[PDB]
């Protein structure tokens, strides 16, 4: 027998197992005893009839298999099965220490109360209760025997309504207030009203006693009315401060809540002066920084100077703010002072280090740390590394991921450097980037920006105007080179193409044979629909990589509105730095820099922005 024979029997046993030919599976499994991935086939057999599986069998799977990611999911999973069974004496014997999952922990503490360890159940119920996030259904039987025990503190109860309202969980607020501790039963209708309809907030304030609870409830509802109508909220602040005997620091916070809502170029000149007053009076670095960003995207050189200076000493240390202080200093004629700041920034890594070298006309120097010439045995020789080798062979990238996480996680910065290089050398490109992140090996440039899928980006950007490096830069940022990633909200694959976008792109460009979203997990299909959407977005924004990158992430239209606000008034960097969306702002900064490292590795000059990008006005 041999590893190659073992791979055909694995593929063949998975076919029969998926088609349910259990007689063939039965026959075939004991032979696969020595294949790296046999724990997975055992895990599959066990989870296949879990409802009538004995604790002995599950306990021995877990016991022999400590480094294996699905063994841990089985603990938390069999705990809930013993809970379904109502075997509370079996659950504690199986899982003596709390499990990792929230459903599992709820069940584990309800088991403690059923086996007489009550004060342990209440240490668990209290810590599962202090949260405005809705908990598992499992947990509802814990919290009722707790509450019924008289051991539930009435403040622990009000604090969960305080946490639920802050978290936007207006539903948990209504159930919570719905069956309430008799000590607070007079404010229970007011709290349901406020959560339902926030505009009632002044009535809440002017009705209930002003305690710190009622003030925090009224503050969160207030934040909601400023979002519906900023003028309503602005004028409501004197009555609210009165009704609740609000201290000055409390009143400054109501002003910041409204100030945030008056940041457009559609607020009345009365609103603008009110706003800037509140902001000049604020202890909030974020509100002041949004304000600097407003001076920047409007070309206001005086507001920039004024507001930049109001930033806390700590904030002024940030690369962008260090760059816009040297920007203003250069206007005022203070050349040496300013070029000291741009030469120091040029010693660091990233967007502003590169913008600075470009701005004063010097060559940016890339610092690339050499990765070790030896990746010795122990790492490279284990059990877990053999499961990783196989999982990658079968393109099981997200499973390979979880196995690599455990493996790189407790080694020294040198072995994590060897592990990156090893993966780099077997062309496991997403595993190279992961070991780099994990081991924070930030100046190991080769292993962080590997030239992945070169011939396919080559091919699919040959009849297109978008440079190849800019295409690999988008993929690098989107998925960090994992073919099978799927975002929270549906974005799939190598270039993280939304389904709705894949549909419209295959229609505009008349692309053949793309029937379903799952095809977005194929490298070549994803690179074809994706480079097609990126060339579409590039050409309608005049071949400018600032506009095409923010357009691919947020869409065409949001970018078109941002071009409407600045209106020809500002420069490239100030257009980037003033994008009102944190994700898209961060996005353009990484795609522009990453594009410079792929150009460098492809042999061309790693300059951050083209002459037509740098000279245009925005
Ligand atoms: C390539 C692609 O599909 N791009 C789409 C983009 O995806 C973004 C969405 C984002 C995403 O999934 N972000 C994470 C969301 S979360 O924080 O994890 O919840 N990444 C994707 C590609 O970069 O979302 C915007 C918004 O509609 C779309 O613009 S619009 O259709 O014209 O309005 C745009 O077409």
Please describe what this structure looks like.
- The protein has 618 residues and is an all-alpha fold.
- It has 3 domains: 1-363, 70-kda Soluble Lytic Transglycosylase, domain 1 (Alpha Horseshoe), CATH 1.25.20.10; 376-445, Lytic transglycosylase, superhelical linker domain (Methyltransferase, Methionine Synthase (B12-binding Domains), Chain A, domain 1), CATH 1.10.1240; 446-618, Lysozyme (Orthogonal Bundle).
- Helix content is 65%, strand content 0%.
- The chain is built from 37 helices and no strands.
- The chain has helices at 3-18, 22-28, 38-48, 55-64, 69-85, 88-94, 102-114, 118-129, 139-148, 154-166, 170-178, 188-196, 201-205, 212-228, 230-243, 248-259, 269-280, 285-296, 301-309, 319-331, 335-345, 351-359, 377-381, 383-393, 397-408, 415-425, 429-438, 445-448, 454-461, 468-479, 499-508, 523-539, 545-554, 556-566, 572-577, 582-601, 611-615.
- Helix 5 runs antiparallel to helix 6 and helix 24 runs antiparallel to helix 25 (397-408).
- The structure holds ligand BLG.
- Ligand BLG binds next to helix 33.
- This is Soluble lytic murein transglycosylase.
- It holds the Pfam family SLT_L.
- It is an enzyme of class 4 (lyase).
């Amino acid at each position: 027998d041999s590893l190659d024979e073992q791979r055909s029997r694995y593929a063949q046993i998975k076919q029969a197992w998926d088609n349910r030919q259990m007689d063939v599976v039965e026959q075939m499994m004991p032979g696969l005893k020595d294949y790296p991935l046999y724990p997975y086939l055992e895990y599959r057999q066990i989870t296949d009839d879990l409802m009538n599986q004995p604790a002995v069998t599950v306990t021995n799977f877990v016991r022999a298999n400590p480094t294996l990611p699905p063994a841990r999911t089985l603990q938390s999973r069999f705990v809930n099965e013993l809970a379904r069974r109502e075997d509370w004496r079996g659950l504690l014997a199986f899982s003596p220490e709390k499990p990792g999952t929230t459903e599992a922990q709820c069940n584990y503490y309800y088991a403690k109360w059923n086996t007489g360890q009550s004060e342990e159940a209440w240490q668990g119920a209290k810590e599962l209760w202090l949260t405005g996030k809705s908990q598992p259904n499992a947990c509802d039987k814990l919290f009722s025997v707790w509450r019924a025990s008289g051991k539930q503190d009435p403040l622990a109860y009000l604090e969960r309504i305080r946490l639920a309202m802050k978290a936007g969980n207006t539903g948990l607020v209504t159930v919570l207030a719905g069956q309430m501790p008799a000590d607070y039963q007079t404010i229970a209708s007011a709290i349901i009203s406020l959560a339902n309809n926030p505009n009632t907030v002044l009535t809440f304030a002017r009705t209930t006693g002003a305690t710190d609870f009622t003030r925090q409830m009224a503050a969160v509802a207030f934040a909601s009315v400023a979002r519906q109508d900023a003028e309503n909220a602005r004028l409501m602040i004197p009555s609210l401060a009165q009704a609740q005997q609000l201290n000055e620091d409390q009143i400054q916070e109501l002003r910041d809540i409204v100030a945030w809502r008056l940041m457009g170029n559609d607020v009345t000149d009365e609103q603008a002066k009110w706003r800037d007053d509140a902001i000049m009076r604020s202890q909030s670095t974020s509100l002041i920084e949004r304000r600097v960003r407003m001076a920047l995207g409007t070309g206001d050189r005086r507001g920039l100077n004024t507001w930049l200076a109001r930033l806390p000493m700590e904030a002024k240390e940030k690369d962008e703010w260090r760059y816009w202080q040297a920007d203003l200093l250069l206007e005022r004629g203070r050349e040496a002072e300013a070029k000291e700041i741009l030469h120091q920034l040029m010693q660091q890594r990233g967007f502003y280090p590169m913008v600075a070298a470009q701005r004063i006309g010097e060559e940016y120097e890339l610092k690339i740390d050499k990765a070790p010439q030896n990746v010795d045995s122990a790492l490279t020789q284990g059990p877990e590394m053999a499961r990783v080798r196989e999982l990658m062979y079968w393109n099981l990238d997200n499973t390979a991921r979880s196995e690599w996480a455990n493996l790189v996680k407790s080694k020294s910065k040198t072995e994590q450097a060897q592990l990156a290089r090893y993966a780099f050398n077997n062309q496991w490109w997403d595993l190279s980037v992961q070991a780099t992140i994990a081991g924070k090996l930030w100046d190991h440039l080769e292993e962080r920006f590997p030239l992945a899928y070169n011939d396919l980006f080559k091919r699919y950007t040959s009849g297109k105007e978008i440079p190849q490096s800019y295409a690999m830069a988008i993929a690098r940022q989107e998925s960090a080179w994992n073919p099978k990633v799927k975002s929270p909200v549906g974005a799939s694959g190598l270039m993280q193409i939304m389904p709705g976008t894949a549909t419209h792109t295959v229609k505009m460009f008349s692309i053949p044979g793309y029937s379903s979203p799952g095809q977005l997990l194929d490298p070549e299909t994803n690179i074809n629909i994706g480079t097609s959407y990126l060339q579409y977005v590039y050409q309608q924004f005049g071949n400018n990589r600032i506009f095409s990158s923010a357009a691919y992430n947020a869409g065409l239209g949001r970018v078109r509105t941002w071009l409407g606000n600045s209106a020809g008034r500002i420069d490239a960097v100030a257009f980037v730095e003033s994008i009102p969306f944190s994700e898209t702002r961060g996005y353009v900064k990484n795609v522009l820099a990453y594009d410079a490292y792929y150009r460098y590795f492809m042999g061309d000059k790693p300059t951050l922005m083209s002459a037509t990008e740098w000279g245009r006005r925005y």
